[PDB]
Design a protein around this ligand. Structure first.
Ligand code: NA
Ligand code: NA
Length: 290
């Protein structure tokens, strides 16, 4: 039992609403407002769960060590996006459409991440290519089911995204078996061979983008999605079709704009908060749209 004490209220129900298939282990499971997964910490999988005890207090329970609390706390703050949103909210107030987004999803706070590791973020971004998000999430669940860790703790099963070593063992055929196309299976396996992959999170955006796009089959949208969603960098993936739609609805009266036009909007209006606003745009595209 540990507490994460926030300076600002967070609406947990809106945080949880970000997940598309909360009940299915993707690897995350959310049941009755309780978030949980297994995470690999110093070479083994540990159970972690989180839920609010109040508007400014998130309770964490798990079978990791007291001495490991600091590191788990950091990981959860970042993954769930629990950081002080005061400055973001003030900034959003300064733009008519950002203010509307802020009011429609008020208490969502700052952006979290899509993954608990660089490897998970890259693999999921590859999976998601040219398919519906629901289909992508089901594929991730199959892969988690087959090759991810599973920890039983306190009457509950906690599921983890497969390690790089697990994916290497699974191999291209293991991934194809889960429903993944040959080339996507090949690419995830090639990524799994990369050592020190977790270090990418601390690379400069420029070097990280060049690295990501140096893989055949990883281009601009996939790289920028990883950068923003998985690496926490202020890189705005304007090629994303949900993003283009949301920005077009907000600023161009529902008339679909090019990625280059959407990029210009982001530079002019979103500034240092583009990565946070990105998550509000995703919600907007999902939840506000014979
Ligand atoms: Na889930
Ligand atoms: Na490439």
């Amino acid at each position: 039992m540990w507490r994460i004490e926030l300076k600002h209220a967070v609406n947990w129900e809106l945080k949880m609403k970000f997940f598309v298939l909360p009940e299915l282990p993707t690897p995350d499971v959310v049941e009755s407002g309780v978030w949980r997964r297994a995470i690999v910490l110093d070479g083994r999988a540990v159970a972690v769960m989180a839920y609010p005890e109040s508007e400014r207090t998130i309770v964490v329970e798990g079978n990791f060590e007291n001495r490991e609390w600091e590191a788990v706390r950091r990981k959860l703050v970042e993954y769930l996006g629990l950081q002080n949103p005061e400055e973001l909210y003030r900034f959003m107030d300064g733009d008519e459409k950002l203010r509307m987004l802020k009011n429609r999803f008020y208490g969502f706070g700052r952006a979290g991440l899509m993954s608990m590791s660089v490897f998970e973020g890259i693999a999921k971004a590859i999976i998601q290519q040219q398919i519906s998000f629901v289909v992508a999430e089901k594929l991730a669940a199959k892969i988690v089911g087959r090759f991810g860790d599973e920890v039983e703790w306190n009457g509950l099963k906690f599921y983890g995204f497969p390690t790089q070593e697990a994916i290497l063992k699974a191999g291209v055929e293991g991934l194809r078996e889960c429903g993944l196309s040959r080339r996507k299976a090949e690419l995830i396996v090639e990524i799994a061979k990369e050592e020190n992959l977790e270090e990418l999170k601390e690379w400069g955006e420029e070097e990280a983008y060049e690295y990501l796009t140096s893989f055949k089959g990883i281009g601009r949208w996939t790289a920028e999605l990883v950068l923003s969603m998985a690496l926490g960098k202020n890189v705005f993936p304007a090629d994303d079709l949900g993003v283009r739609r949301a920005v077009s609805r907000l600023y161009f009266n529902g008339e679909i704009q090019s990625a280059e036009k959407v990029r210009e909007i982001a530079r002019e209006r979103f500034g240092r908060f583009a990565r946070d606003i990105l998550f509000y745009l995703f919600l907007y595209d999902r939840f506000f749209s014979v």
